[PDB]
Design a protein around this motif. Sequence first.
Motif, PDB file in Angstrom:
ATOM      1  N   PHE A  39       1.251  -1.474   0.259  1.00  0.00           N
ATOM      2  CA  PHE A  39      -0.438  -0.124   0.342  1.00  0.00           C
ATOM      3  C   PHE A  39       0.780   1.464   0.155  1.00  0.00           C
ATOM      4  N   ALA A  40       0.867   2.073  -1.454  1.00  0.00           N
ATOM      5  CA  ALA A  40       2.002   2.837  -1.216  1.00  0.00           C
ATOM      6  C   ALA A  40       1.442   4.588  -1.526  1.00  0.00           C
ATOM      7  N   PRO A  41       1.807   4.788   0.060  1.00  0.00           N
ATOM      8  CA  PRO A  41       1.248   6.629  -0.383  1.00  0.00           C
ATOM      9  C   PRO A  41       2.078   7.473  -0.894  1.00  0.00           C
ATOM     10  N   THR A  42       0.951   8.259  -1.567  1.00  0.00           N
ATOM     11  CA  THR A  42       1.441   9.461  -2.359  1.00  0.00           C
ATOM     12  C   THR A  42       1.984  10.905  -1.769  1.00  0.00           C
ATOM     13  N   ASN A  43       3.162  11.034  -2.425  1.00  0.00           N
ATOM     14  CA  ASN A  43       3.797  12.395  -2.110  1.00  0.00           C
ATOM     15  C   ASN A  43       2.939  12.874  -0.806  1.00  0.00           C
ATOM     16  N   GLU A  44       1.565  13.400  -1.511  1.00  0.00           N
ATOM     17  CA  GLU A  44       0.055  14.322  -1.023  1.00  0.00           C
ATOM     18  C   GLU A  44       0.827  12.928  -0.016  1.00  0.00           C
ATOM     19  N   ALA A  45       0.254  11.675   1.006  1.00  0.00           N
ATOM     20  CA  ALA A  45       0.056  11.310   1.836  1.00  0.00           C
ATOM     21  C   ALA A  45       0.895  11.883   2.563  1.00  0.00           C
ATOM     22  N   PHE A  46       2.463  11.476   2.540  1.00  0.00           N
ATOM     23  CA  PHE A  46       3.380  12.148   2.995  1.00  0.00           C
ATOM     24  C   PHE A  46       3.575  13.988   3.231  1.00  0.00           C
ATOM     25  N   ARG A  47       3.015  14.407   2.215  1.00  0.00           N
ATOM     26  CA  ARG A  47       2.997  16.385   1.816  1.00  0.00           C
ATOM     27  C   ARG A  47       1.650  16.262   3.643  1.00  0.00           C
ATOM     28  N   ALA A  48       1.014  15.413   4.125  1.00  0.00           N
ATOM     29  CA  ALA A  48      -0.270  15.729   4.115  1.00  0.00           C
ATOM     30  C   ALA A  48      -0.017  15.842   6.534  1.00  0.00           C
ATOM     31  N   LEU A  49       1.372  15.022   6.264  1.00  0.00           N
ATOM     32  CA  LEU A  49       1.418  14.736   7.345  1.00  0.00           C
ATOM     33  C   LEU A  49       2.049  15.708   8.632  1.00  0.00           C
ATOM     34  N   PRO A  50       1.585  16.128   9.177  1.00  0.00           N
ATOM     35  CA  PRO A  50       1.668  17.375  10.760  1.00  0.00           C
ATOM     36  C   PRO A  50       2.878  17.297  11.031  1.00  0.00           C
ATOM     37  N   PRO A  51       3.876  18.232  11.334  1.00  0.00           N
ATOM     38  CA  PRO A  51       5.069  18.911  11.207  1.00  0.00           C
ATOM     39  C   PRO A  51       5.695  18.349  12.395  1.00  0.00           C
ATOM     40  N   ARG A  52       5.080  17.651  13.739  1.00  0.00           N
ATOM     41  CA  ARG A  52       5.930  17.401  14.500  1.00  0.00           C
ATOM     42  C   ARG A  52       6.165  15.475  14.804  1.00  0.00           C
ATOM     43  N   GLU A  53       4.703  15.562  13.798  1.00  0.00           N
ATOM     44  CA  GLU A  53       4.685  13.836  13.348  1.00  0.00           C
ATOM     45  C   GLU A  53       5.598  13.469  12.001  1.00  0.00           C
ATOM     46  N   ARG A  54       5.761  14.681  10.698  1.00  0.00           N
ATOM     47  CA  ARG A  54       6.362  14.514  10.112  1.00  0.00           C
ATOM     48  C   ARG A  54       7.709  14.001  10.609  1.00  0.00           C
ATOM     49  N   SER A  55       8.176  15.444  11.385  1.00  0.00           N
ATOM     50  CA  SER A  55      10.012  14.777  12.091  1.00  0.00           C
ATOM     51  C   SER A  55       9.728  13.335  13.347  1.00  0.00           C
ATOM     52  N   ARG A  56       9.088  13.028  13.684  1.00  0.00           N
ATOM     53  CA  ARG A  56       8.726  11.377  14.176  1.00  0.00           C
ATOM     54  C   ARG A  56       9.242  10.172  12.663  1.00  0.00           C
ATOM     55  N   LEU A  57       8.889  10.802  12.378  1.00  0.00           N
ATOM     56  CA  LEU A  57       9.054   9.950  11.309  1.00  0.00           C
ATOM     57  C   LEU A  57       9.800   9.609  10.746  1.00  0.00           C
ATOM     58  N   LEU A  58      10.680  10.733  10.011  1.00  0.00           N
ATOM     59  CA  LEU A  58      11.201  11.290   9.302  1.00  0.00           C
ATOM     60  C   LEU A  58      12.719  11.738   9.698  1.00  0.00           C
ATOM     61  N   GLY A  59      12.320  11.622  10.857  1.00  0.00           N
ATOM     62  CA  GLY A  59      14.048  12.528  11.340  1.00  0.00           C
ATOM     63  C   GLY A  59      14.053  11.115  12.637  1.00  0.00           C
ATOM     64  N   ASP A  60      14.055   9.899  12.285  1.00  0.00           N
ATOM     65  CA  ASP A  60      14.091   8.613  12.730  1.00  0.00           C
ATOM     66  C   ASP A  60      13.823   7.656  12.030  1.00  0.00           C
ATOM     67  N   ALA A  61      15.887   6.727  12.066  1.00  0.00           N
ATOM     68  CA  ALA A  61      15.680   5.361  11.225  1.00  0.00           C
ATOM     69  C   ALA A  61      14.707   4.401  11.522  1.00  0.00           C
ATOM     70  N   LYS A  62      14.412   4.318  12.987  1.00  0.00           N
ATOM     71  CA  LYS A  62      14.317   3.490  12.838  1.00  0.00           C
ATOM     72  C   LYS A  62      12.224   3.754  13.180  1.00  0.00           C
ATOM     73  N   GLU A  63      11.664   4.690  13.193  1.00  0.00           N
ATOM     74  CA  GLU A  63      10.373   5.432  12.792  1.00  0.00           C
ATOM     75  C   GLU A  63      10.536   4.500  11.889  1.00  0.00           C
ATOM     76  N   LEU A  64      10.997   5.196  10.449  1.00  0.00           N
ATOM     77  CA  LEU A  64      10.518   4.791   9.004  1.00  0.00           C
ATOM     78  C   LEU A  64      10.319   3.135   8.938  1.00  0.00           C
ATOM     79  N   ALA A  65      11.310   2.481   8.803  1.00  0.00           N
ATOM     80  CA  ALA A  65      11.478   1.090   9.007  1.00  0.00           C
ATOM     81  C   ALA A  65      10.474   0.906   9.498  1.00  0.00           C
ATOM     82  N   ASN A  66      10.216   0.951  10.631  1.00  0.00           N
ATOM     83  CA  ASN A  66       9.021   0.255  10.811  1.00  0.00           C
ATOM     84  C   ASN A  66       7.768   0.827  10.743  1.00  0.00           C
ATOM     85  N   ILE A  67       7.604   1.579  10.035  1.00  0.00           N
ATOM     86  CA  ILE A  67       6.279   2.187   9.469  1.00  0.00           C
ATOM     87  C   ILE A  67       6.382   1.712   8.183  1.00  0.00           C
TER      88      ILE A  67
END
Length: 131
Positions: A39-67
Amino acid sequence: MGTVMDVLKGDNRFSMLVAAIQSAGLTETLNREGVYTVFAPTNEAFRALPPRERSRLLGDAKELANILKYHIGDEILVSGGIGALVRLKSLQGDKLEVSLKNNVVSVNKEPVAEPDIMATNGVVHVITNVL
């Protein structure tokens, strides 16, 4: 045809997703062999993300791998094939609730912008929010 990895690199709207795939080092996996429902999220899916949440996901290597690992199903599952509410072991470990309504497939109560796209090693379903 192409693996999942290249149906992904071939649509200029999954840009964030691929880099993120590289960064998690899930490139070979989705480019090698197997049977995955992605299930592939489009750039928009990522673009839709709220900032603290954008940073928790993408500012953490373990985050992403997990998600990222969670948007990836274990089996191959296209629309025709959903006769009941289906649960897919994600490569992360937790299930993906798939189902069908008015020809629109759903995953975790979120509509797929474009049902199942093929690939030599699985299938991908486009969505516009991250799971």
